[PDB]
């Protein structure tokens, strides 16, 4: 069952964050109400005190306040935050931090960004190859609605397949077809048909001498 998601951020190690489209209006409503509350209780007159693991509000580069979590306090001028509804990280001064009121907590609405990786593909170990794959994904899916299916859990993030909204083409499989990534095989019998399809695309990418396979194998 492929669910609609909005892809927000692509990491340098080929992970990505998504928002669930089904809860997008709930997030927007929370953000409108939180920002109305911030306007009546300006952080400048509030004296929040940032600490690691503590939630906060953080003012992003669009001049709007968002929900965040403090990850590291380097100095008063350098507080490292993670925007819990988007997945991006930022270093900011204390002038751009405030209290997250309980009315807008993750108990009221869960963190809206979830981190995933692509199922059935290996992240390239070579830096330039990895950059090529990340750049392809950023161009094709960053800040777009896609369809997502969770395939398997791992010792890290869950691994998923993504489809383009329009064509319904499998995004990860596209990378394999382009020779941008290698296939990661698994043993589960329910993945055998899809892994078979990915390996077939990989062999065709090798024959076409694309990207990873430009000079042969």
């Amino acid at each position: 069952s492929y669910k609609p998601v909005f892809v927000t951020e692509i990491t340098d190690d080929l992970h990505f964050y998504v928002q669930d489209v089904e809860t997008g209006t709930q997030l927007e409503k929370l953000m409108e109400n939180m920002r109305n509350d911030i306007a009546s209780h300006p952080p400048v007159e509030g004296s929040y005190a940032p600490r690691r693991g503590e939630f906060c509000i953080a003012k992003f580069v669009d001049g709007e306040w968002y929900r965040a979590r403090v990850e590291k306090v380097e100095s008063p001028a350098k507080i490292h935050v993670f925007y819990i509804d988007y997945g991006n990280r930022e270093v900011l001064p204390s002038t751009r931090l405030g209290t997250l009121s309980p009315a807008f907590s993750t108990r009221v609405l869960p963190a809206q960004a979830t981190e995933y990786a692509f199922a059935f593909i290996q992240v390239p170990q070579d830096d330039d190859a990895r950059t090529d794959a990340v750049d392809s994904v950023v161009r094709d899916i960053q800040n777009t609605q896609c369809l997502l299916n969770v395939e398997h859990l791992s010792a890290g993030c869950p691994h998923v397949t993504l489809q383009f909204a329009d064509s319904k083409g499998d995004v990860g499989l596209g990378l394999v077809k382009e020779g941008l990534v290698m296939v990661e095989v698994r043993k589960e019998k329910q993945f055998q048909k899809v892994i078979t399809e990915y390996l077939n695309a990989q062999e065709s990418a090798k024959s076409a001498r694309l990207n990873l396979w430009r000079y042969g194998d």
Binding site: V5, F6, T8, Q19, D20, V21, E22, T23, G24, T25, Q26, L27, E28, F60, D62, E64, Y86, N143, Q145
Partner: peptide
């Protein structure tokens, strides 16, 4: 505004 889901 900021790119985000349009539910």
């Amino acid at each position: 505004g900021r790119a985000r889901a349009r539910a």
